Amino acid sequence: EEVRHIPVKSIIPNRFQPRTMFDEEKIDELALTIRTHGIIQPIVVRECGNGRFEIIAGERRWRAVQKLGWTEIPAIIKNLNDKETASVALIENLQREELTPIEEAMAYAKLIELHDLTQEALAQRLGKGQSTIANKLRLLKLPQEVQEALLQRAITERHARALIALKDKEKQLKLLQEIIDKQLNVKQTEDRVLKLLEA
Amino acid sequence: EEVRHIPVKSIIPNRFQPRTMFDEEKIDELALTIRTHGIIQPIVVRECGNGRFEIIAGERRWRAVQKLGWTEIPAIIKNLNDKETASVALIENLQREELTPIEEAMAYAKLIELHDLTQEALAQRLGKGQSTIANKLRLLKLPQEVQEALLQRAITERHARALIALKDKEKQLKLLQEIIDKQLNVKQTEDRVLKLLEA
């Protein structure tokens, strides 16, 4: 019903920790993205007790704003028993789907058009490397079938990166079918990619 | 400030689509998980115009509730220009971190303890297969170092699954170092795993 502003310092992460490993590279991108357009989704908490709140969902948002130095955060309070909290806390983390590398690439291109930005401008805004931005956009040059493999998560982005060098659609497609069917890794893809350019 | 209830049928997904591929397997797990404990995080929308709302963030929530047959959904309305919406819409999707397979496993074990449930009970509640639940929990039996590799995303869950069969900690660890350093795939791991049990 009501979005609430709650003290960042009075918040304790969920006892049944759903997340054990936390990438600071990513969490900083979040703190940066929150500096620009603020916290878009409030953090879900329950009252742990008197004036203290247990995070249901939104640890990264909490840690990013902590780094930002914000004194309070937007929350939604839901009355829940200790069992409900732990369950929900695990489901909101189990039911997360990350965007596919091709889509991450597509999005990067959208922001390049919309904010009329350089690959350096993008890296600075999204809190990642010029390298990572450039290399992911390069995947849009790949043949469409390879691009569809990327979304179907048939191939990794590193498998595809090597295929960019072949510079022949047919050769790339022939290898793609080998990679998925033979189930090649990144190493033996790169290996095979070089052998072809040599020959 | 105020969480709002808005008509599911008056909502249009973002024009600059951040997500192109949508796994129904997952989206159904979400609709199921929403049947049980409801929509925990309201969906962020802007007013596209008169009585119509453009999704900023929460397409999966929207599609899951649509399948559930819900007539309205909880939203947060933010006034934004067409440029702001598109940008934010891409960032809320770019800054998503999925849980690591070991953590997905750990969470599954928590719910098994908390709801005192069978692997079948878990599969039914989380909307996935008994197989997927069983196979992911089996990773908790693996040696700790392998488990740390899993969180560091050094190895895939399929690389690890094969190592469960070796049933010797040392042999598993020796292979682990080979997998990461030699950069072996799932195929050549399984291959090597069998060769050892044969010999």
Residue numbers in the entry:
A (entry chain A), B (entry chain A): 26 to 224
Give sentences from the paper.
Here, we report that a nucleoid occlusion protein Noc is a CTPase enzyme whose membrane-binding activity is directly regulated by a CTP switch. In Bacillus subtilis, Noc nucleates on 16 bp NBS sites before associating with neighboring non-specific DNA to form large membrane-associated nucleoprotein complexes to physically occlude assembly of the cell division machinery. Unusually, Noc is also a peripheral membrane protein that directly associates with the cell membrane via a predicted N-terminal amphipathic helix (Adams et al., 2015). We provide evidence that (1) CTP is required for Noc to form the NBS-dependent nucleoprotein complex, and (2) CTP binding switches Noc from a membrane-inactive auto-repressed state to a membrane-active state.
However, in the presence of CTPɣS, we were able to grow and collect 2.95 Å diffraction data for a crystal of a further truncated G. thermoleovorans NocNΔ26ΔCTD variant, which lacks both the N-terminal membrane-targeting helix and the C-terminal domain. After solving its structure, it was apparent that NocNΔ26ΔCTD had adopted an alternative conformation to that of NocΔCTD. However, there was no clear electron density for a bound nucleotide in our structure; instead a sulfate anion from the crystallization solution occupies a position equivalent to that of the β-phosphate of the nucleotide in the B. subtilis ParBΔCTD-CDP structure (Soh et al., 2019). We further observed that helix α5 in the NocΔN26ΔCTD structure swings outward by 104° and no longer forms a bundle with helix α6 from the same subunit and that this movement might drive the self-dimerization at the NTD of Noc (i.e., the NTD engagement). By superimposing the NTDs of NocΔCTD and NocNΔ26ΔCTD (RMSD = 1.49 Å), we detected severe clashes between α1, α2, and the opposite subunit of NocNΔ26ΔCTD. Therefore, it is clear that the autoinhibitory state of α1 and α2 (as observed in NocΔCTD) is not compatible with the alternative conformation in the NocNΔ26ΔCTD structure. The lack of a bound nucleotide in the NocNΔ26ΔCTD structure prevents us from drawing a conclusion on the role of CTP and the possible conformational liberation of the amphipathic helix α1. However, several lines of evidence suggest that CTP might favor the NTD-engagement conformation as observed in our NocNΔ26ΔCTD structure: (1) CTP/CTPɣS promoted the crosslinking between symmetrical E29C residues, a readout for NTD engagement; (2) the conformation of NocNΔ26ΔCTD is highly similar to that of a nucleotide-bound B. subtilis ParB (Soh et al., 2019); and (3) CTP/CTPɣS enables Noc (WT) to co-sediment with liposomes.
